[PDB]
Design a protein around this ligand. Structure first.
Ligand code: CU
Ligand code: CU
Ligand code: CU
Ligand code: CU
Lengths: 77, 277
């Protein structure tokens, strides 16, 4: 059961999520249309490549955490 | 071949360590360690192949990765060894670790940029090249995303766990490896990455030289655990899909097994390691 999709503007940036050198991928997140690698842990929490050691409950929470971490910076693919 | 507590290094040792790290960066060798680490942390998954993290091989993998890095350092200056950071003791931003003569301090509040020390972007000697976003400067926010580093009492609770690892051999596991890694329990290793912040909180965490000192202490805690539990040893021991068993070889080297890395003394000793008491 993948999480639902989402789409919102968070701190001025568009964050989107959708079910789908890095792992497989059951879910995709984008920050301003650049893909954010995210990964699900066994307990259902999520991390991302810009907050890898810090589980959060949902892919939207990981997208928001990434926007927080980036401080306006473009993501690199 | 002796790994020492960072807090005990002489001015001369700090200088030689910094210079060897900067030379690996200048020559291009450093960034390939950052890249290797990132590939593994982005591919290791709880339900599929996992080798560098979230799995029993987390400890021997990082032990061999640190040995590769130390040998590269020693190719520049044979007197240099990896120091370790006991974050249970040196737990504030005023620790000598974070002085301008060693790793420099925390990042300014505007953009997290480290402004002092040998790795500050303004030196021109530490470009962040292997990166997940556009920023090319070292960042830190010490104590920003989590208030406190683990304490000695918390470390001792984990060292008392007798089983090395347990099925399902991932971030859900009970046992020593996952409590040391930090996905369950009071959280040791993951929480330190979060406490440093900046690139250390990301998949490209070897961009911060403190990465090596953090993992050298995690590696010392594995050695301490072994001394506390001479009757316990690496698991699993054969036939486990997606997980590196004791006598299986490990990527990326392919020629070494967890079995070849359990005894650190074949490669280095510590300034102090208590005997089985
Ligand atoms: Cu992936
Ligand atoms: Cu790692
Ligand atoms: Cu780590
Ligand atoms: Cu005994």
């Amino acid at each position: 059961a993948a999480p639902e999709s989402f789409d919102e503007v968070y701190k001025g940036r568009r964050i989107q999520g959708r079910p789908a050198h890095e792992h497989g991928g059951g879910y995709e997140v984008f920050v301003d249309g650049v893909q954010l690698h995210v990964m699900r842990n066994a307990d259902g929490s999520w991390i991302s490549v810009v907050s890898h050691y810090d589980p959060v409950p949902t892919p939207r929470a990981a997208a928001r955490a990434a926007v927080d971490e980036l401080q306006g910076a473009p993501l690199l693919p | 071949t002796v790994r020492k507590n960072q807090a005990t290094l002489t001015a001369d040792e700090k200088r030689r360590f910094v210079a060897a790290v900067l030379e690996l960066k200048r020559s291009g060798r450093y960034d390939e360690f950052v890249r290797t680490h990132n590939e593994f942390i982005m591919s290791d998954t709880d339900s599929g192949e996992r080798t560098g993290h979230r799995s029993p091989s987390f400890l021997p993998w990082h032990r061999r990765f640190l040995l590769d890095f130390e040998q590269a350092l020693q190719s520049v200056d044979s007197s240099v060894t990896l120091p370790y950071w006991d974050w249970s003791a040196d737990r504030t931003v005023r620790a000598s670790l974070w002085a301008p003569d060693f790793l420099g301090g925390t990042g300014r509040s505007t953009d997290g940029r480290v402004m002092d020390g040998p790795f500050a972007a303004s030196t021109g000697n530490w470009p962040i090249n292997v990166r997940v976003d556009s920023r090319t400067y070292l960042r830190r926010s010490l104590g920003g995303s989590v208030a406190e580093l683990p304490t000695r009492a918390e470390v001792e609770s984990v060292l008392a766990i007798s089983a090395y690892d347990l099925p399902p051999y991932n971030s859900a596991s009970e046992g020593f490896r996952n409590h040391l890694e930090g996905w369950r329990g009071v959280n040791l290793h993951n929480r330190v990455h979060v406490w440093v912040g900046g690139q250390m909180a990301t998949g490209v965490s070897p961009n911060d030289p403190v990465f090596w000192l953090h993992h050298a202490y995690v590696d010392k805690l594995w050695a301490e655990w072994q001394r506390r539990h001479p009757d316990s040893a690496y698991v699993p021991t054969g036939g486990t899909p997606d997980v590196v068993d004791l006598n299986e070889t490990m990527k990326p080297w392919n020629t070494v097994r967890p079995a070849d890395l359990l005894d650190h003394t074949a490669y280095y000793t510590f300034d102090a390691l208590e005997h089985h008491h």
